[PDB]
Enzyme design. Sequence first.
Site, short mmCIF file in Angstrom:
data_model
loop_
_atom_site.label_atom_id
_atom_site.label_comp_id
_atom_site.label_asym_id
_atom_site.label_seq_id
_atom_site.Cartn_x
_atom_site.Cartn_y
_atom_site.Cartn_z
N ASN A 191 0.87 -1.17 0.00
CA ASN A 191 0.00 0.00 0.00
C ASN A 191 0.91 1.23 0.00
OD1 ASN A 191 -2.70 1.20 2.24
ND2 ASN A 191 -1.87 1.98 0.30
N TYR A 228 -10.19 11.16 8.81
CA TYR A 228 -9.09 11.86 8.18
C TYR A 228 -8.93 13.27 8.77
CZ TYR A 228 -8.24 8.39 4.46
OH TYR A 228 -7.91 7.28 3.72
N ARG A 277 -14.87 5.02 7.14
CA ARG A 277 -14.60 3.60 7.29
C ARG A 277 -13.83 3.26 8.56
NH1 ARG A 277 -10.14 5.08 4.41
NH2 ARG A 277 -8.25 3.79 4.66
N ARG A 296 -12.62 0.08 12.75
CA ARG A 296 -11.30 -0.12 13.36
C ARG A 296 -11.40 -0.25 14.87
NH1 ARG A 296 -7.60 4.24 9.87
NH2 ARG A 296 -7.89 3.18 7.85
N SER A 297 -11.06 -1.44 15.36
CA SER A 297 -11.12 -1.73 16.79
C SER A 297 -10.28 -0.79 17.66
CB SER A 297 -10.67 -3.18 17.03
OG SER A 297 -9.34 -3.37 16.57
N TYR A 298 -9.13 -0.36 17.15
CA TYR A 298 -8.26 0.54 17.90
C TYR A 298 -8.67 2.00 17.80
CZ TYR A 298 -6.41 0.62 13.16
OH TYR A 298 -6.29 0.68 11.80
N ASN A 358 -9.99 -1.17 1.02
CA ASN A 358 -9.02 -2.02 1.71
C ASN A 358 -9.69 -3.01 2.67
OD1 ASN A 358 -6.93 -0.55 0.43
ND2 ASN A 358 -7.05 1.01 2.05
N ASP A 360 -36.21 19.10 24.11
CA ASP A 360 -36.04 17.81 24.79
C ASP A 360 -36.53 16.62 23.97
OD1 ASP A 360 -38.73 18.68 25.05
OD2 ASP A 360 -39.03 17.47 26.84
N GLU A 361 -36.90 16.84 22.71
CA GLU A 361 -37.37 15.76 21.86
C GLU A 361 -37.00 15.96 20.39
OE1 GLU A 361 -41.20 17.90 22.53
OE2 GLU A 361 -39.24 18.77 22.04
#
Length: 752
Positions: free
Chosen positions: A121, A230, A284, A288-290, A399, A491-492
């Site tokens: 990449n 980004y 995207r 990503r877990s991190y 990716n 409030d709604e």
Amino acid sequence: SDEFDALRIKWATLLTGGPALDPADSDIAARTDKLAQDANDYWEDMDLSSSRTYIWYALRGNGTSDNVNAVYERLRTMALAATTVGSSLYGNADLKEDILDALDWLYVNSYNSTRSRSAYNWWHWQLGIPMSLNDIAVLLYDDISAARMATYMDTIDYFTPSIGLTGAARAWQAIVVGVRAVIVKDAVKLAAARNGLSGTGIFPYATGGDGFYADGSFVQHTTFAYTGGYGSSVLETTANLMYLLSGSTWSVSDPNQSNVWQWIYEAYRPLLYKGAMMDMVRGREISRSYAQDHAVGHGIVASIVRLAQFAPAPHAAAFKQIAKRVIQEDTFSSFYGDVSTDTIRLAKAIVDDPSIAPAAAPNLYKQYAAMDRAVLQRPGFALGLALYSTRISSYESINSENGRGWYTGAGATYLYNQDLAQYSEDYWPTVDAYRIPGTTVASGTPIASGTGTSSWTGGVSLAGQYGASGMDLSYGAYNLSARKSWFMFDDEIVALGSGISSTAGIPIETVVDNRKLNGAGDNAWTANGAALSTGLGVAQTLTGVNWVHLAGNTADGSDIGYYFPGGATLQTKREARTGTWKQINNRPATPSTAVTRNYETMWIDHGTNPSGASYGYVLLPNKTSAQVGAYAADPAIEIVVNTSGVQSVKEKTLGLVGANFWTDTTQTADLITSNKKASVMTREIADERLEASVSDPTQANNGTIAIELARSAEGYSADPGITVTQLAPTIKFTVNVNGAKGKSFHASFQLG
Ligand SMILES: [Ca+2]
């Protein structure tokens, strides 16, 4: 010494926290231990044989950018642990040498000028790896011989000799060219690095394409809302480089640099909720877990703290107050837990300073017209709305990332409350991606990644206090159309759907909500005053429902109420869903560990091939069961209209009337008449005045919007662009929207 050595040491401190890094500070020491452990873990797994064919077996493949980038990251972590005061590895010569030998092995077998600059990449080869290697070179500078530095720096110059891209990429190139410039002491390159920040997608506001917009929006890759993805990167890199250069021969002199202050106030502050950076602007990266919402927010505050260091008055001060508030707000994840030791140092100094008061929490309605996003911030909650159109894409997936992002931007509502963990703790790899809250879709059917065919997406803002948004739905993957609106009051939030039609032959449904429940999945919930079973794995239809109440994952501050004007029939299920991040982010480094989260999912079944179907519900954040019932008995809002021609809701207690006109023909909603597509909201103070805000959400009207209000006025004042043609017997004015880019025009009429 020279100014370069001065700058080099400046960056080094930014990376390690410096020599004065109080190892006695609880959080610092905690962070420095996690650091030293990770370093030790990697070091102990290294193949130290001179004949090795890789540094780490789990990252072998001198041609796999993903792996090589990871190898450099590890070596970077090791270097930090070897240079951060307080670390159990500080000054350890052996570690230092093992790291330098690794870089040499890599130079010889993987990272060198015999490789293609654009091989997959390209990002790793030109930006990712150089950013890590520069940091290493700066840290172990003293222990790096000339011969070695040459191979490192010469390689970076090969891959990224200059700055030419845009947005995040450009900034990354700038910090790459810059730090290397400081290392090799190249004043020319260093100046180019400084100038890089004035380029497209950075300092200067964008009127199209990638970059920050004047309205507060951030776009990347042409059509994606990306403030939190980004945008975070541009912010971090811009802040780091500006701070580095600040006060030096190459300090940033571009006047546009003051735009940076606005990004914080207008682009980030409104999209932060107690430490979380809203996913609707993360593209995207939500896969990503991190980089879950709080981890990302922590990163944005780190950047704000970095800016507080050099920014001028009264910005530096405001930055500190904002940072302080956010750090105090986030009780889900310790801010200090996942930021640099230098960030912790500079942050503790702000938090422990009694003269600095936490800034007020944002309270407003904001229309991010440039990126089809809108947000409402109130005491106790924040509602984010993500839309798409001919200008903004449905979602991004490249990716192998964010493969189920389908409806994350198709009229999706995100409610933030005291359950700070709602979208974190593996929400994304477990939630039913076909049922994003607020959306209307063909059951279990996906859509493509791309822009829509309708330009009517956006809304109106009434003095930044209240607002209304709308989205003209028409999917490309299959047949389904509808008019979806959202009216944001105090409030709604009232969601309206009309003209829901389809010939797809697939059951159509609209998701009222889909919340991640507590570990036991036993959150109490009620309907029409009757408790509902709390067991997991139970599906159940609720018929003739006037209101539903769902107890939150916190003792208080996270309950959610739902009111249905005219009653409704809801399809629901409470279940434990399992998944893995690998499922939505199929990259080698992605963890495949399975996770299980509980969900309460509710939606309206519009049947197969509906024609002119509709719906109407009200979100009542943080109200108790009794309060929802009380609201249901005498609701503050009233649906004025809900046709494919016009959707309108009135808020009786506030004298507010919101209306979305879907066509270019004269239509009337209560006191409001419009001749063209428009988003309109008025506020009437009995016998005193009538406020009005109007916008052209299509951003395509080259003329005006003719509005008439059924009230007689005595006088007025209005924003430029508005021309009043009559005040009595009724109010009449036009709004010049040519090139307005979805902004709202305000007018205030004196009644009498
Ligand atoms: Ca109300």
